[PDB]
Design a protein around this ligand. Sequence first.
Ligand SMILES: CN1CCc2c(-c3ccc(S(O)(O)N(C)C)cc3)cc3c(c2C1)NC(=O)/C3=N/O[C@@H](CCO)C(=O)O
Ligand SMILES: N[C@@H](CCC(=O)O)C(=O)O
Lengths: 257, 257
Amino acid sequence: TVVVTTILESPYVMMKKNHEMLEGNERYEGYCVDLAAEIAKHCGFKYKLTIVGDGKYGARDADTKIWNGMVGELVYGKADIAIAPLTITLVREEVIDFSKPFMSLGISIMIKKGTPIESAEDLSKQTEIAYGTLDSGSTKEFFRRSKIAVFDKMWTYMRSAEPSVFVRTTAEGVARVRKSKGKYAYLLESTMNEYIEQRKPCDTMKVGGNLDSKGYGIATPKGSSLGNAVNLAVLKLNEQGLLDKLKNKWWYDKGEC
Amino acid sequence: TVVVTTILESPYVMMKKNHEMLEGNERYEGYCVDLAAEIAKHCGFKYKLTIVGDGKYGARDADTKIWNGMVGELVYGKADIAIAPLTITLVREEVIDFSKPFMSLGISIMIKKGTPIESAEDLSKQTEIAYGTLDSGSTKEFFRRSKIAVFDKMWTYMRSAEPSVFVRTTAEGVARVRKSKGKYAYLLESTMNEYIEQRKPCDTMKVGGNLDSKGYGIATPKGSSLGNAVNLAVLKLNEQGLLDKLKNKWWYDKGEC
Ligand SMILES: CN1CCc2c(-c3ccc(S(O)(O)N(C)C)cc3)cc3c(c2C1)NC(=O)/C3=N/O[C@@H](CCO)C(=O)O
Ligand SMILES: N[C@@H](CCC(=O)O)C(=O)O
């Protein structure tokens, strides 16, 4: 029985409204829930879904240099695999094995429909329409370390923008965009931006291209034999068109706009 | 001195206009020539840019079960690493090592302006306008192993159409689209499709969205010690935004069309 570590993140892994009457992996539904099922069938193994304790994805603490989240639960032999929207990064790659990305993404711009913004350069060229990110995370860090002119300017603006353009959560960012009457833009993951875009009141949308390129990947303990079989699974699921099917399923079929 | 095998596919790898007045790797230019320079810089090693002998990307022969193109040169010990627009595929993942994707792409359609086609389905619904792909390419491998209605049908057509709708090289396919008077559509990766569309004589065009989603990856023989190093360098060059830089530098459209 393979211990699968994941995290509650809609539409990846969520609990059904009636998860009370259900039990086991049946309580959950979502993109990663179906993917986990597909990976297990192509690899031939029984799995049990568990939610990462600290609700973190994976980061090494500067102080204790200890890994937390789903990445930590892997490097310390607590879980056999990680099936969630885990982004493939250098530091992470160094401590765990990553299969080829099962979904692409990148920092994108979320504006309230009607907002006269077309790209990142447009935002950096003005201030009448405030824009921000999470007051903590990779999105924020992305600008704090960007050598690109457009992004470097955006960082200077944001860090000195008044009132504060940083939000504490994704919910706050989305709500602020919906309440600012087109006077505020939020920078978040494309997958999450295009997901909200399919949710009523349907007043938001993604604009322009992503400011960068990332990709989620299934993770296994560095050196785990299970990693190879899972990688081929991903590639096969992608080639057969299944990954595009699961995407269209939880993002558009269940759409609302 | 690491031996790097690559293919002349512009804007990835091309021979400088005055290459005869040059020598060494300095003879070439392109996205992959730069990427290679960066990979070698970080991994710390000398290299030589060799061109794939049989001028193919890679494909296994059903009967002999022998690989050709770059995949072959890596499998049979002819090259230490492959730095070119090599598509990461299941069948290739099984015989060679791949680094995480350094660039994304998807099969697309190239046509001569005025061609009554604007989607893969349109082509699959007729025969007046012939269409094929590149030999020993991942695109041809796609349709052949595809079980997705439209694609499965397109494959059947292709291997039954007369004369042969297939071509030996990308240029051979592009030239056919321009000379066929619209009586031939070419299926090639969007990356190469969009580049050529912004170039003279400005007679080709990309229609409809891509048919799939994947990405090019750095390849090395299985077990190769370069694998890890190169992979981490790829993830770093991405996080540093170096990949996007090269992407914008070589795909920069100076409005010829
Ligand atoms: C599809 N999306 C959904 C949200 C999300 C969040 C995420 C979680 C909470 C929130 S919040 O509730 O609004 N908040 C700010 C508390 C916002 C974003 C964080 C991470 C992530 C994803 C995937 N993938 C990662 O690799 C990752 N690393 O995350 C890193 C930390 C940040 O870089 C890690 O956990 O190591
Ligand atoms: N990228 C393909 C070649 C181009 C194509 O098939 O259109 C490969 O690596 O085989």
